[PDB]
């Protein structure tokens, strides 16, 4: 049915960090050939409610974007993992230890005794570049929510929703064969 | 074996092993095919690819 | 009319094949009927 369609549940490819095509939700569907119109109305209302919930979930969670599935994602769109502050303590004072050794002292380490100072280093071990690329599972399930395609495949061929096909690259739009 | 008992053909995909072919023993697919040919094609002309 | 949903899902008394299918699919079938002929794969009801 075009009015109330089955949502297009996406498929995740956890090597490239991107969706690999989409297909209709043929797994979570309820049979109604044993039901008369009284329950047919209920089932249709349930499907419509599910479609509405999917649409509003898309509006809430999915980030706006021109392409349906950008294979390579911008750095800012990708949710980077937070990193804590690393505190490290310098154990030994090299210049004072060198002075003591030059004046004829042997130090067998394990605050020492001869060093009154005590310095600490605090820094953030951020990656040099903010890891532009694929999408993790959490962000994928957050953003690539099931799609409700109301009027299916109506119009010119270039107006169809591509990337529903599992084997389809956006660059040089075509289907990759063997 | 068409519309037989134990001898039932299957077109099931590898997904769920769910057969896409059901026979009822109340349906005559042989006669249906004969009528279909007699109504679509000029059956008075002999063909050798099938008998 | 206690069987209309069934007779519409299985196209016994529902809508014509030209207008329950995708319009793009209808265009494809009418474009490639000369050699590939999708037209005979879909049933359209005939209701008295």
């Amino acid at each position: 049915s075009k009015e109330i369609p089955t949502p297009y549940v996406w498929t995740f490819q956890p090597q490239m960090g991107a969706a690999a095509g989409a297909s209709q939700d043929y797994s979570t569907r309820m049979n109604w050939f044993s039901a008369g119109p009284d329950m047919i109305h209920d089932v249709n209302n349930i499907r419509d409610a599910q479609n509405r919930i999917l649409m509003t979930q898309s509006a809430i969670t999915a980030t706006p974007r021109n392409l349906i599935d950008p294979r390579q994602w911008a750095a800012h769109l990708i949710k980077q993992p937070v990193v804590g502050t690393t505190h490290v303590e310098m154990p030994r004072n090299e210049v004072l230890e060198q002075h003591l050794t030059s004046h004829g002292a042997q130090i067998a380490g394990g605050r020492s005794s001869f060093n009154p100072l005590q310095t600490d280093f605090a820094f953030h071990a951020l990656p040099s570049r903010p890891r532009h690329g694929g999408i993790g599972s959490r962000q994928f399930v957050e953003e690539f929510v099931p799609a409700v395609y109301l009027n299916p495949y109506s119009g010119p061929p270039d107006s169809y929703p591509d990337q529903f096909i599992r084997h389809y690259n956006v660059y040089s739009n075509s289907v990759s064969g063997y | 074996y068409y519309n037989s008992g134990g001898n039932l053909g299957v077109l099931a995909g590898q997904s769920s092993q769910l057969n896409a072919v059901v026979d009822l023993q109340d349906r005559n697919t042989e006669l249906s095919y004969q009528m279909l040919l007699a109504n679509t094609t000029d059956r008075s002309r002999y063909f050798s690819m099938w008998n | 009319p206690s069987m209309l949903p069934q007779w519409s899902y299985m196209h016994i008394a529902g809508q014509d094949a030209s207008e329950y299918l995708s319009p793009g699919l209808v265009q494809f079938a009418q474009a490639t009927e000369s050699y590939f002929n999708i037209g005979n794969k879909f049933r359209n009801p005939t209701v008295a």
């Binding site: - | - | 094949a17 030209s18 009418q30 879909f42």
Partner: peptide
Amino acid sequence: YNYAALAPRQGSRPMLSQWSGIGTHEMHGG
């Protein structure tokens, strides 16, 4: 595209078929 690239071109206009040509009904018991 227009799907006219998939049909033979009798000159310029494509040799498109009827819009309602799709679909069939052939069923009688006798």
